[PDB]
Amino acid sequence: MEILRYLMDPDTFTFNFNNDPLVLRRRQTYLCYEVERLDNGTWVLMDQHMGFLCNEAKNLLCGFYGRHAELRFLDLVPSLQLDPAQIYRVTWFISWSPCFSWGCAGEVRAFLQENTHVRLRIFAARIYDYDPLYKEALQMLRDAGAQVSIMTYDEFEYCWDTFVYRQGCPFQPWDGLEEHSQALSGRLRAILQNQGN
Numbered sequence: 035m036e037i038l039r040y041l042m043d044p045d046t047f048t049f050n051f052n053n054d055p056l057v058l059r060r061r062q063t064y065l066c067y068e069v070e071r072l073d074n075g076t077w078v079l080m081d082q083h084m085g086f087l088c089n090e091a092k093n094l095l096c097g098f099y100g101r102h103a104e105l106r107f108l109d110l111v112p113s114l115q116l117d118p119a120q121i122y123r124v125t126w127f128i129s130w131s132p133c134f135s136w137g138c139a140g141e142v143r144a145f146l147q148e149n150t151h152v153r154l155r156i157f158a159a160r161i162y163d164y165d166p167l168y169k170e171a172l173q174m175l176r177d178a179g180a181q182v183s184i185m186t187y188d189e190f191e192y193c194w195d196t197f198v199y200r201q202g203c204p205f206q207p208w209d210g211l212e213e214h215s216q217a218l219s220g221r222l223r224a225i226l227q228n229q230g231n
């Protein structure tokens with residue numbers, strides 16, 4: 035009886051998050067999921083229930099279609115053996131924005147209701163230009179009870195130091211990390227409204 039982890043690698047973590055200024059394809063995506071247990075009135079990160087999810091994973095032997103880490107999650111949550119007694123809260127760290135509601139987000143909503151004991155917080159690093167539909171899908175998401183926002187500097191460090199282990203070395207993105215946090219913020223935050231049709 036032992037535990038099972040994975041801890042993504044740096045070269046990959048940085049790369050996958052590096053990509054390029056604009057998007058590439060509505061297929062290559064990477065989301066980082068974690069689990070927190072409110073202990074002593076504070077949130078505590080649990081490594082035994084933490085990990086990252088990619089596009090294609092297990093259950094592929096069935097020849098199923100569509101590969102989104104968001105979906106894979108909804109399937110792995112049961113593995114976290116949650117409980118309706120205590121209070122949990124998972125955090126999603128994606129180097130991009132959701133694809134669509136009825137697609138991915140829509141699913142996250144149905145799940146948010148199924149398990150009200152566990153809350154879900156989303157955090158995107160960049161906005162999808164080739165897919166400006168995620169906006170509407172988002173509004174529907176926050177409505178599910180979850181909360182979304184833009185990744186900050188200190189935030190990235192938490193994920194980099196948490197998910198990627200490297201002699202406890204500091205995080206190193208590029209240079210426009212902050213400059214982006216402000217710019218993107220204005221955009222995302224502004225999109226968190228989208229009214230007047």
Ligand SMILES: [Zn+2]
Binds near residue numbers: 104132133137139
């Ligand atoms: Zn999707």
